[PDB]
Amino acid sequence: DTEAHVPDVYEEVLGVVPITTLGPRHYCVILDPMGPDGKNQLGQKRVVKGEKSFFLQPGERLERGIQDVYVLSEQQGLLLKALQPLEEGESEEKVSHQAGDCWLIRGPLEYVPSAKVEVVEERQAIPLDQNEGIYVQDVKTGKVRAVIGSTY
Amino acid sequence: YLPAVFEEVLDLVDAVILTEKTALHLRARQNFKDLRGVAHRTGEEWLVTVQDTEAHVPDVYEEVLGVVPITTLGPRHYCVILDPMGPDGKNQLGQKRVVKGEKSFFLQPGERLERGIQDVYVLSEQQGLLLKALQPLEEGESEEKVSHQAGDCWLIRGPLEYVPSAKVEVVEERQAIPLDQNEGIYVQDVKTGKVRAVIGSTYMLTQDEVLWEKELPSGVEELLNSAPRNKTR
C-alpha cells in the first residue's frame, strides 16, 4: 500500500511487526485469526504451513511460535488424539477420526497437527528378530499378544 | 557548481564503488525514478550492480543500507537461500531454494543463506547418504525418478554426487562395512525386524537396517581360544 507511511494525525502507531515467515519445514498456529470478514475470530486457531510468510495481523498471535514440522521415519510415529471429531478431510487418509480416538500415524510421511488433533507421544519403533518379541498388551481389548518375528 | 541564492550546500556525496565483486544494497526513502529509469517505491530494497551502473551515486531518494559481496558457489558447492524472491520480485519468505552448479549471485535484499556455502555431498562406492524426505513428492528431484513420500528413509548409495534439495534432509553417513566369506554383520531389518546375518560379500546397511546385538550364554571365552568381541558382526 505505502512503503513509507507518515503517521497520520488520525492514527496512533501501536508498533511495527516483523514478518513471520514459515520455512519449507515449518508450521505456526495463529491464535485468534480473522476470517474473510476482517474480524478477529478469537479462540480459534489456524495452522499455517507450506513456505508461507505473512504478517501477524492485529489481534492475531502465535500459539507457541514457529516450532518445527513433525518429521517421522519408518521407525517413527505420531500417536495422535483427536481433540475435535470429524477428521474426515484433514489428511490423505480420508478416515473420519472421531473426538479423541487415539490413532497412530506411521510411515514415510510428514505431519502437520491440525487445530483439531493433538500429539501425545513419539512411539519409537522396537527392533525384533525371530524368536524375539515384545509383550504387547492391546489395551483396547486387553489381549496380550507377545508379537515376535519381524520388528514390531 | 556555483550555488544559487537558495541552495544550501550539504556534504559532497561520492559515488559508491561497484565492482562485480560487490553490489550496493539500498532502500529507497520515497517514490522516484532512478537514473536507469525504474520506478521505485517508498522502501523497496533492490540491488544495483555493474550491469546497471558501475559507479552509483547515492541518490537523495535512496538510503544506502550496505554493500553485499558476491556469493559465489564453486564447482563443488551448494547454498540454501532462505527467503528468495520468485519471478514477481517479491520475497517468498519461509521457502528455501538450493542453488548449485558453479553459480555466482548476489544475496538479494531479504535473502539469506541457511548455513552458508558449506560443501557438496560426495559419496564413494563405500559411502552413502541416509536421507529422510521431510516433504513428500520427490518424483523429479533426481535421476532416480522414484517418488519418495514424506519421511520415508531411503539410502542413496553408489558413484554419484548429491545435493540435498529443500524437501530432503540428511540423517547419517552410513559408511560401508567390509565383509569376506564366512564373515558378516548381524543386520536387523528394522522395517521388518528380521535379522538376516548377511555374510559373504561386503554389506552396508540399507535404509532400514541396524546392527543387531548377538548375546552368548557365557560361552565366549571357550570359543575365542582381553579385547572384547565385536558382538554385532
UniProtKB/Swiss-Prot annotation, chain A:
The vault ribonucleoprotein particle is a huge (400 A x 670 A) cage structure of 12.9 MDa. It consists of a dimer of half-vaults, with each half-vault comprising 39 identical major vault protein (MVP) chains, PARP4 and one or more vault RNAs (vRNAs). Interacts with TEP1. Interacts with PTEN and activated MAPK1. The phosphorylated protein interacts with the SH2 domains of PTPN11 and SRC. Interacts with APEX1. May interact with ZNF540. It is found in: Cytoplasm; Nucleus. MVP 3 mediates interaction with PTEN. MVP repeats lie at residues 19-69, 70-125. Phosphorylated on Tyr residues after EGF stimulation. Dephosphorylated by PTPN11. It comes from Rattus norvegicus. It comes from the Eukaryota. This is Major vault protein. Required for normal vault structure. Vaults are multi-subunit structures that may act as scaffolds for proteins involved in signal transduction. Vaults may also play a role in nucleo-cytoplasmic transport. Down-regulates IFNG-mediated STAT1 signaling and subsequent activation of JAK. Down-regulates SRC activity and signaling through MAP kinases.
